Enzyme design. Structure first.
Site, PDB file in Angstrom:
ATOM      1  N   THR A  33      -4.059   1.949  -3.334  1.00  0.00           N
ATOM      2  CA  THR A  33      -4.509   1.522  -4.472  1.00  0.00           C
ATOM      3  C   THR A  33      -5.651   3.088  -5.023  1.00  0.00           C
ATOM      4  O   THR A  33      -5.657   3.606  -4.346  1.00  0.00           O
ATOM      5  CB  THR A  33      -5.364   0.324  -4.324  1.00  0.00           C
ATOM      6  OG1 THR A  33      -6.683   0.717  -3.592  1.00  0.00           O
ATOM      7  CG2 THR A  33      -4.504  -0.812  -3.696  1.00  0.00           C
ATOM      8  N   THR A  34      -5.582   2.607  -6.435  1.00  0.00           N
ATOM      9  CA  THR A  34      -6.661   3.643  -6.954  1.00  0.00           C
ATOM     10  C   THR A  34      -8.024   3.439  -6.815  1.00  0.00           C
ATOM     11  O   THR A  34      -8.483   2.436  -6.504  1.00  0.00           O
ATOM     12  CB  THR A  34      -6.213   3.636  -8.626  1.00  0.00           C
ATOM     13  OG1 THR A  34      -4.769   3.250  -8.857  1.00  0.00           O
ATOM     14  CG2 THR A  34      -6.585   4.645  -9.218  1.00  0.00           C
TER      15      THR A  34
END
Ligand SMILES: [Cl-]
Ligand SMILES: [Mg+2]
Lengths: 235, 243, 111, 244, 241, 195, 250, 231, 240
Positions: B30-31
């Site tokens: 995930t970012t």
């Protein structure tokens, strides 16, 4: 080559699954649990007629209230028995009591997965651990090299296991007497054994609350074999 | 060939393919972002809501080291936790011996050396995380980003994970449009926006926003989580910008 | 030179009946000629209908009781919630005490 | 991990052989021939130096024959460096026995222990075996004059006459032909040289390509002397037997 | 072919892992240079900051090992910092044990011996770096000593390292043929830095701004790096001549 | 433990050892054999600290018996005595040393000669025509200096030994309850039952 | 983590070859030529200084190394492997000899200790053999002058004269013609320079040639005076000027 | 394929295959369900037997008076991890006189599982765990996976056909979360949830295994005739 | 330390290293054990490709473990020394702690346990050796003969053979040995042992070794001439 503690794509340990194949090659062992006692019986399977069959020790005492039958690479069982005996006696020293059959089995099964890169490979032997205690009464356990153990009303392990287990399924009920259970082990052993069953190539044992764990004599087993043959011919 | 099968083996190029393969695990995650500001740093992360059954606000991904350093990471979440546990030990032994809390550049090298050590032997695996971290020390604010190879640099803004390119582009605009500097409270609001914009690269599941910050003025030099009114204010700011 | 032992005083008393048992103890804790507490209990319910007291050096007494309480807990985990009998508890305590034969707990224990 | 690069030196083949031991023996078969001959009144050790260069210093050289104590010597066949590791161990073991019992070590005991060390390298540890075969020549008051050999497997056996290294098949046939039990040292010296002279891969056997040693009771009254032959002494014994 | 994966000999007497570690040296695409003055030793290196988001002050391949010793690395930054931290520890320990500051050539030897161990021992890989150590030694004067992944090391009159190393090397060779001497005959270190930059410009054929270079200077009793403004002042002096 | 004596004569070695085992104010036993056979032609008597004596004797016995099996050969008395001395020499610088004194009486079959070795707890070895440990020596040595001859028979040696025991029974403070006597010669080890 | 390579990386192949030792010898073959000649009153050891770059100071790189005051060493093959061997060889001369006997070891025994170190790299876990052959020249009171070669296997041989490395086959043939048992030290230095000129291709002078002797005692090089028994090191490294003097009358 | 020989090796797409194969052992395991309200937390586990003659494999393990888990996969690995949890719960009690937070329990399991996925020689744990507990911040339910990943949830299920029960709980979320001060109704919801993962077989008296912990309820397990109420 | 698991299971449930150790036993020289009414006899083959041997000093095939127990073997000779040494040490250790010599069953159980440990210990290969352990328990006149093998299994035998061509000599013993009536005397037991080896050996010269063990530590090795008399007697009766 490849790691000893490696998982297969199906989610099983290769070495554990391969040890289970070794256990299938081993001689047959059968256990039956009743309210009057637990009976343990084994196929001796002498490799040659010159071999003195009474030296084949495949049923073994752990304590007075716990017995053990084996199947597979039987040499591997020596250290498992040694550990069980020490565990049983050590518990009596620390707590002034007999050790629960389940707790003993659990202690043995903790050794099972202590392998890798500890010992170099899993055990190549399955154990039937039969016993009695005050809490849960007469018990029969099947201890594998996976580290898993199941309690059983009756259980067969070894080369004739799948055929014997199906026979035990039909024959076992909750009201079996000890005498009935003795004959049933002899009956089922005679069915799955290659050579013809007698007192020299098969061995019986039991564990009762009163008398503890007892391996039967060749004279005593011979009379049960003769009693079994007469009862099958009688109908 | 076979040069990619074992860690710490140079290929004929001069490359450690196992480390490059660990970077792929980071790119899959995930970012997460980091924004350096006037007197501190701001961290933010994308938390994918896999199911309705996930408890909101109760799967915290940003971690604190000592009392003044914040750490966030993308990739294998357990590998990030292992790295932070080491970070805490390194920071503890520094403060034990030298009294003062560990400076951020000093701390950055402690992680760097530890991660680099996991590229020296075939008996260990490289870290499957890029770690964005930083805080406030005696010399002011510092933001760092550390990679599986052990490589780290200082940053004005940092991003990693699946939406790193979207986040990097948005970060580059902030650096250009604010040469004199960005404030702490602004950076929190911008962080929210950049996570929402970077979520466009991971838009099947909807997500939960999580922000933290260190600031000499706003948090008194200590690491704190952004919660309640200040969090909802940043969410509303981000919601307004996407539409 | 440092003396690792001390005497916290007090006294305890156990009597056994037909279908019951008592374990009593005073609540005073002391060092030399000073009173530390007028109410500091030293007779404890350890679970499984076992009461225990380890009177003498209070630090050693608290440590022992703490270890036995923990021994009861692990007996339940390892042996399918089985009730620890009083005779089994007694033998377990002997091993706790003798384990420190060459640096002993300065306590008289009663269960 | 490192499993990938492990040769597994201490395993069995499907046929029940130890790969590394067999290949170490193959190594030894190319080494210079060494012969031991045991007589009634002494022992001879003869050994052929590996393809000598004319600029090799011959008089201050030791390749094949080594002294373990005053009563025991060895002839080497294989890797010299490996042999020296084992020799210094054997030298120490002899002095440990002397320190403990105040008696010189019996030959077999020294041989067994050195052979037990070699055995260890074939069963455990994952290391390559020692690429060395020894001929042990020694004396003690129990068995008198004794010849043994050991090889990389760690297996040792006793002999009246034996060869190790190159052309042992041919050498053993020639020894088996001319050897007899009532033999003297001076005759055994002649047999050792004649056997090397025929089995050698060289054109002609010369003093500069040989190491030679005897263990006689030729000292004064009931005591053993080790004679490691000098270059000039080998030159004279080679002329005396009529080889050159 | 597992003889190419670990540090053991190939049939032709080669260590492929060592050779591939040499190729990792140029992964950063940076060229360094080192020259000696009368009183000083100057080292210069290219500085490339591609990402706009990077903090350019933290991007560096020059290290202050001790007060007197400086080190520039050609190779990836993780291995560079690994080598730097170790060198710093070795220099500190030397001073404590032996009661004087570790010489540049002795540290070079020590780091080279460590590099040698990685070429012989299997479990440790070589570091993909070339370490150039510089100082003004109290016995030997201005000193340049360089280490590589093979464990080789040697002193230098001057040196260069990187992708376009050979162009810089011949440029310097031709100057010392002409001058007939082992060093830059110059009083102040400022002009020795100007020499270093000038000859790098000629060899590489590129111009430099203040942020395209990184400079380290060793004088008696201290080694120090130059700031952007210190380099800018130096670039102005070259341009006005 | 207290009295152990030894006399080497022409063709044999004779070891006398007291029978009393005393602890405190009680003689616990009056028939104790303070010796172990190490090999068929080697006997070791012992005296010293309680527990240590037997533990040491049996440990040496085990090692010599192990050697005998391994080599299928009896170790010489000189070789056994050197092995014993070294074990005591190691012991003295240990954390807790063996406080045991020994006499080693053996018949060397190769030399056809009896041999008597006296070794104290420090590891001090001496070969002697006659030996003793403890306070016994303060009486017996001077007595043997006078009456001993090197060419004596076994029977003459036993009378010489009777002379020592009589003197010890007369002048020693403690009741040591007589001695067990054993003879070591070419035919092995045998016990004199009536002494 | 931890060194999991506890197994031999050098093993026997079916043919009986130890592969890594052979390959180490191949690396020695590629290396620059070095030689040694023994005279009646001395020993000479020599080699070419192959410069990696003309900017590099070849004086700082020492191919010929002092091990003890009376023993020197030179090599062919991998320079880093040689450097660490010299460090270990110097240390073992002290730990396993001088700290015990209060005097420096004789040549043959120091050679034996170096050989042991090289043998262990052939058999121990997780290591490759050393990629060098050494030539060790030395003097000691009871053996006199001596010259030894030491190979990657750990084997060593004494020599009257020999050469190793690049052009060793031609160099050994040249030495066979010129060597006699009545050579004085100066004659052996002359022959060493002649033999080495054949293998060297580029410049041939005191700056590209490294040469040392084991000869007479040098009281001037001792550093002190007052002890009559201490007479100074027999090892001397010839200077750049001293070599050029002998190249004129060549 | 070439990158699944051990846990130390990454694949070219950045995957750890040995960890994924360990994850596969959980899918083969028998179904177990976890759910909670604000007052109580419940574990419901379908036990599995070898045959009619055998006993049913016990799925639920007690860790402390206020915490315990259910297992799915390799039972010996659950024993190792539960024993570690028992020690950590116990260390927190003896040293700090403090009941171990359910969140910290998860963090400790995560870090223990992780070390086995980064070192040569070892292997990943082959079991998934559902940890329930009641601590100072109310009721909790955790899902452990042997990759290291631990997740706090209102409800979940793991094992074979666990997607059926997981969908049900996702629909029922709003109902069962507000079953406060009512143990029997929360169990009923858990029993109805696990029923959505059943095929051919139904819930019998010696097949079902339930456990509960809450505000004024210690961690207790129900088996045999005690669970007959909920069939 | 070297840790590698060398002995491991294969897909079909076999430990190949243990099975390949059995092949090394099959290669080894033949060894036979026959127990009579009041004795046990251990016969051993010696290959005749080795001439110029010194039989005085060459290691004998039958080894004494204690004064009342003996051990012969088939397989790797170097491996056998390690088992014999350990067994000899344990024999003396048992005397020291129990104050009684080992039983033959106990000594076998120990040796078999050592062999088993090497089948599941890291870094080691199994012993390429099977043993025949024979003797008499202390204060007992019942003969004992046991067999061990690399796997670690052990068992008691009325008569047994191991090594090369052992299946031929086992075939001989299976028909010629009567359980109801074993060899009543020493001569009968030795003859049956020599007969069984003569099925396999080649010549009865310096190829057969015989060792007779009787009760109360009475062990003796037969000489060439003594064995040759049995060989001469058997061949004359055969021609019929
Ligand atoms: Cl160093
Ligand atoms: Mg004395």
């Amino acid at each position: 080559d490849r790691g000893v503690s490696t998982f297969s794509p199906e989610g099983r340990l290769f070495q554990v699954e391969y040890s289970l194949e070794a256990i299938k090659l081993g001689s047959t062992a059968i256990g039956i649990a009743t309210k009057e006692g637990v009976v343990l019986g084994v196929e001796k399977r002498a490799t040659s007629p010159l071999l003195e069959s009474d030296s084949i020790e495949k049923i073994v005492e752990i304590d007075r209230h716990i017995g053990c039958a084996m199947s597979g690479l039987t040499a591997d069982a020596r250290s498992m028995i040694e550990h069980a005996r020490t565990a049983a006696v050590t518990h009596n020293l620390y707590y002034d009591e007999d050790i629960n059959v389940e707790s003993l089995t659990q202690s043995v099964c903790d050794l099972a997965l202590r392998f890798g890169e500890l010992m170099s490979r899993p055990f190549g032997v399955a154990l039937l651990i039969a016993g009695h205690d005050a809490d849960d009464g007469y018990q029969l356990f099947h201890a594998e090299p996976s580290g898993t153990f199941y309690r059983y009303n009756a259980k067969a392990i070894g080369s004739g296991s799948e055929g014997a287990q199906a026979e035990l399924l039909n024959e076992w009920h909750s009201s079996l007497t000890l005498k009935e259970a003795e004959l049933l082990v002899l009956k089922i052993l005679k069915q799955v054994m290659e050579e013809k069953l007698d007192e020299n190539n098969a061995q019986l044992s039991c564990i009762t609350k009163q008398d503890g764990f007892k391996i039967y004599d060749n004279e005593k087993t011979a009379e049960l074999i003769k009693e079994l043959k007469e009862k099958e011919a009688a109908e | 060939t076979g040069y990619d099968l074992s860690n710490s083996v140079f290929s004929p190029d001069g490359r450690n393919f196992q480390v490059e393969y660990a970077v792929k695990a980071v790119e899959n995650g995930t970012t997460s972002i980091g924004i350096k500001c006037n007197d501190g740093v701001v961290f933010a992360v994308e938390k994918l809501i896999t199911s309705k059954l996930l408890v909101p606000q109760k799967n915290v991904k940003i971690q604190v080291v000592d009392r003044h350093i914040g750490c966030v990471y993308s990739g294998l979440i357990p590998d990030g936790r292992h790295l932070v546990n080491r970070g805490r030990e390194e920071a503890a032994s520094f403060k034990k011996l030298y009294k003062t809390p560990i400076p951020i550049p000093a701390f950055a090298d402690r992680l760097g050396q530890y991660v680099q050590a996991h590229t020296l032997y075939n008996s260990v695996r490289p870290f499957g995380v890029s770690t964005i971290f930083g805080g406030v020390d005696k010399n002011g604010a510092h933001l760092y980003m550390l990679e599986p190879s052990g490589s780290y640099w200082g940053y004005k803004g940092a991003a990693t994970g699946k939406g790193r390119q979207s986040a990097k582009a948005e970060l580059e605009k902030l650096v250009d449009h604010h040469p004199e500097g960005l404030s702490a409270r602004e950076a929190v609001k911008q962080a929210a926006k950049i996570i929402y914009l970077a979520h466009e690269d991971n838009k099947e599941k909807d997500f939960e926003l999580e922000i933290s910050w260190c600031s000499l003025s706003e948090t008194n030099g200590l690491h704190k989580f952004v919660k309640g009114d200040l969090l909802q204010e940043a969410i509303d700011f981000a919601q307004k910008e996407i539409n | 030179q440092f003396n690792p032992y001390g005497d916290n005083g007090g006294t305890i008393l156990g009597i056994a009946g037909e279908d019951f048992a008592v374990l009593a103890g005073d609540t005073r804790n002391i060092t030399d000629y000073s009173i530390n507490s007028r109410y500091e209990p030293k007779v404890f319910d350890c679970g499984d209908n076992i009461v225990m007291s380890a009177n003498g050096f209070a630090a050693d007494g608290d440590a022992l009781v703490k270890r036995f309480k923990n021994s009861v807990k692990w007996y339940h985990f390892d042996h399918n919630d089985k009730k620890l009998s009083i005779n089994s508890a007694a033998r377990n305590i002997q091993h706790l005490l003798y384990g420190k034969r060459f640096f002993p707990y300065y306590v008289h224990t009663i269960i | 991990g490192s499993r990938r690069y492990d040769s597994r030196t201490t395993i069995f083949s499907p046929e029940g052989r130890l790969y590394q031991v067999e290949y170490a023996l193959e190594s030894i078969s190319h080494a210079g021939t060494a012969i031991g001959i045991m007589a009634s009144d002494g022992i001879v050790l003869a050994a052929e130096r590996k393809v000598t260069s004319t600029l090799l210093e011959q008089d201050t050289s030791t390749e094949k024959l080594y002294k373990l104590n005053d009563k025991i010597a060895v002839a080497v066949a294989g890797l010299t460096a490996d042999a020296e590791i084992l020799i210094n161990t054997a030298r120490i073991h002899a002095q440990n026995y002397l320190k403990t019992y105040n008696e010189d070590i019996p030959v077999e005991i020294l041989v067994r222990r050195l052979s037990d060390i070699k055995q260890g390298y074939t069963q455990h540890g994952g290391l390559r075996p020692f690429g060395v075969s020894f001929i042990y020549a020694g004396y003690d008051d129990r068995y008198g004059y004794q010849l043994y050999t050991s090889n990389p497997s760690g297996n040792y056996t006793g002999w009246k006459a034996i060869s190790v290294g190159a052309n042992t098949s041919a050498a053993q046939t020639l020894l088996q032909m001319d050897y007899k039990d009532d033999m003297k040292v001076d005759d055994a010296i002649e047999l050792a040289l004649k056997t090397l002279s025929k089995t050698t891969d060289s054109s002609a056997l010369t003093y500069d390509r040989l190491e030679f040693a005897t263990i006689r009771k030729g000292a004064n009254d009931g005591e053993v002397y080790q004679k490691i032959f000098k270059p000039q002494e080998i030159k004279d014994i080679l002329v005396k037997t009529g080889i050159t | 072919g597992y003889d190419r994966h670990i540090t053991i000999f190939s049939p032709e007497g080669r260590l492929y892992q060592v050779e591939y570690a040499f190729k990792a040296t140029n992964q950063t695409n940076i060229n360094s240079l080192a020259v000696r003055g009368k009183d000083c030793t100057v080292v210069i290196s290219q500085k490339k900051v591609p990402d706009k988001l990077l903090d350019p002050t933290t991007v560096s391949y020059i290290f202050c090992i001790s007060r007197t010793i400086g080190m520039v690395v050609n190779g990836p930054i993780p291995d560079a910092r690994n080598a730097a931290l170790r060198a710093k520890a070795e220099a500190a320990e030397f001073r404590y044990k032996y009661g004087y500051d570790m010489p540049c050539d002795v540290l070079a030897k020590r780091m080279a011996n460590l590099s040698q161990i990685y070429t012989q021992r299997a479990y440790m890989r070589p570091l993909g770096v070339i370490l150039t150590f510089v100082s003004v030694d109290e016995e030997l004067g201005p000193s340049i000593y360089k280490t590589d992944p093979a464990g080789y090391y040697v002193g230098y009159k001057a040196t260069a390292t990187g992708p376009k190393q050979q162009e810089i090397t011949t440029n310097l060779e031709n100057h010392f043929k002409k001058s007939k001497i082992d060093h830059i005959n110059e009083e102040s270190w400022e002009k020795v830095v100007e020499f270093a930059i000038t000859h790098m410009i000629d060899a590489l054929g590129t111009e430099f701004s203040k942020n395209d270079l990184e400079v380290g200077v060793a004088t008696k009793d201290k080694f120090f790096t130059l700031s952007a403004e210190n380099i800018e002042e130096r670039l102005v002096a070259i341009a006005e001549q | 433990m207290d009295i152990i004596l030894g006399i080497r004569v022409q063709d044999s070695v004779i070891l006398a050892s007291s029978k009393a085992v005393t602890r405190g104010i009680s003689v616990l036993k009056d028939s104790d054999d303070k010796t172990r056979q190490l090999s068929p032609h080697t006997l070791m008597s012992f005296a010293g600290e309680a527990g240590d004596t037997v533990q040491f004797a049996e440990y040496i016995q085990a090692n010599i018996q192990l050697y005998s099996i391994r080599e299928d050969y009896e170790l010489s008395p000189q070789a056994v005595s050197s092995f014993v001395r070294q074990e005591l020499a190691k012991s003295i610088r240990s954390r807790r040393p063996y406080q045991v004194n020994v006499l080693i009486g053996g018949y060397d079959k190769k030399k056809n000669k009896p041999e008597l070795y006296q070794i104290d707890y420090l590891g001090t070895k001496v070969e002697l025509p006659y030996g003793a440990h403890g306070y016994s020596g303060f009486y017996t040595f001077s007595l043997l200096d006078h009456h001993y001859r090197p060419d004596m028979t076994t029977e003459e040696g036993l009378d010489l030994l009777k002379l020592c025991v009589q003197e010890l029974e007369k002048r020693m403070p403690m009741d040591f309850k007589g001695v067990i006597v054993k003879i070591v010669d070419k035919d092995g080890i045998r016990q004199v039952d009536d002494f | 983590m931890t060194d999991r390579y506890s197994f031999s990386l050098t093993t026997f192949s079916p043919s009986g070859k130890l592969g890594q030792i052979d390959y180490a010898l191949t690396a020695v073959k590629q290396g620059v030529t070095s030689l040694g000649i023994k005279a009646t009153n001395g020993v000479v050891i020599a080699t070419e200084k192959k410069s990696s770059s003309p900017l590099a100071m070849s004086e700082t790189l020492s191919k010929v190394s002092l091990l003890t005051p009376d023993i020197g060493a030179v090599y062919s093959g991998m320079g880093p492997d040689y450097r660490v061997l010299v460090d270990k060889s110097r240390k073992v001369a002290h730990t396993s000899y001088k700290r015990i006997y209060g005097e420096y070891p004789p040549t043959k025994l120091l050679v034996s200790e170096v050989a042991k170190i090289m043998q262990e790299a052939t058999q121990s876990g997780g290591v490759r053999p050393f990629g060098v052959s050494l030539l060790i020249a030395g003097h000691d009171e009871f053996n006199g002058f001596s010259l030894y070669q030491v190979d990657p296997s750990g084997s060593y041989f004494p020599w009257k004269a020999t050469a190793i490395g690049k052009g060793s086959v031609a160099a050994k043939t040249f030495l066979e013609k010129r060597w006699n048992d009545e050579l004085e030290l100066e004659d052996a230095i002359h022959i060493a320079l002649l033999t080495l000129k054949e293998s060297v291709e580029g410049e041939f002078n005191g700056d590209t040639i490294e040469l040392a002797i084991i000869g007479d005692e040098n009281p001037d090089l001792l550093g002190y005076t007052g002890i009559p028994t201490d007479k100074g090191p027999r090892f001397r490294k010839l200077t750049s000027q001293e070599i050029n003097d002998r190249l004129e009358a060549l | 394929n070439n990158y699944d020989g051990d846990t130390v090796t990454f694949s070219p797409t950045g995957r750890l295959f040995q960890v994924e194969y360990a994850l596969e052992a959980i899918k083969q395991g028998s179904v177990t369900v976890g759910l909670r309200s604000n007052t109580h937390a419940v574990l419901v586990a379908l036990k599995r037997n070898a045959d009619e003659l055998s006993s049913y494999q016990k799925k639920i393990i007690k860790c402390d008076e206020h915490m315990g888990l259910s297992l799915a996969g390799l039972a010996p690995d659950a024993r190792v991890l539960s024993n570690y949890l028992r020690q950590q719960c116990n260390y927190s009690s003896l040293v700090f006189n403090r009941k171990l937070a359910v969140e910290r329990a998860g963090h400790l399991l995560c870090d223990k599982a992780q070390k086995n996925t980064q070192s040569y020689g070892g292997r990943p744990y082959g079991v998934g765990l559902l940890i329930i507990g009641y601590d100072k911040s109310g009721a909790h339910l955790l899902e452990f996976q042997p990759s290291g990943n631990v997740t706090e949830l209102y409800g979940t299920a793991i094992g074979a056909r666990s997607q059926g029960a997981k969908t049900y709980l996702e629909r029922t979320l709003d109902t069962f979360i507000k079953i406060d001060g009512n143990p029997d109704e929360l169990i009923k919801a858990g029993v109805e949830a696990i029923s959505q993962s059943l095929r051919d077989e139904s819930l019998t008296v010696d097949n079902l295994s339930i456990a509960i912990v809450g505000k004024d309820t210690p961690f207790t397990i129900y088996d045999g005739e005690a669970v007959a109420k909920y069939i | 330390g070297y840790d590698r698991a060398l002995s491991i299971f294969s897909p079909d449930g076999h430990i190949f290293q243990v099975e390949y150790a059995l092949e090394a036993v099959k290669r080894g020289t033949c060894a036979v054990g026959v127990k009579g009414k009041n004795c046990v006899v251990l016969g051993c083959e010696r290959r005749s490709t080795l001439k110029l041997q010194d039989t005085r000093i060459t290691p004998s095939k039958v080894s004494k473990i204690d004064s009342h127990v003996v051990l012969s073997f088939s397989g790797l000779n170097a491996d056998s020394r390690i088992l014999i040494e350990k067994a000899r040490v344990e024999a003396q250790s048992h005397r020291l702690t129990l104050e009684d010599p080992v039983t033959v069953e106990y000594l076998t159980r120990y040796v078999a346990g050592v062999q088993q440990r090497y089948t599941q210990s890291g870094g080691v290969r199994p012993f390429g050796v099977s043993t025949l352990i024979a003797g008499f328990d202390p204060r007992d006149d019942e003969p004992k003969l046991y067999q061990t093998e690399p796997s670690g299994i052990y068992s008691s035998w009325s008569a047994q053979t191991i090594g090369r061509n052992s299946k031929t000599v086992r075939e001989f013993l299976e028909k010629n040995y009567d359980r109801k009536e074993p060899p009543a005397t020493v001569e009968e037991c030795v003859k049956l042992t020599v007969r069984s080896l003569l099925e396999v050996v080649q010549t009865g010269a310096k190829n057969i070794e015989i060792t007779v063990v009787k009760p109360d530590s009475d062990i003796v090795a037969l000489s060439s001439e003594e064995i040759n008399q049995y060989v001469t007697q058997i061949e004359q009766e055969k021609q019929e």
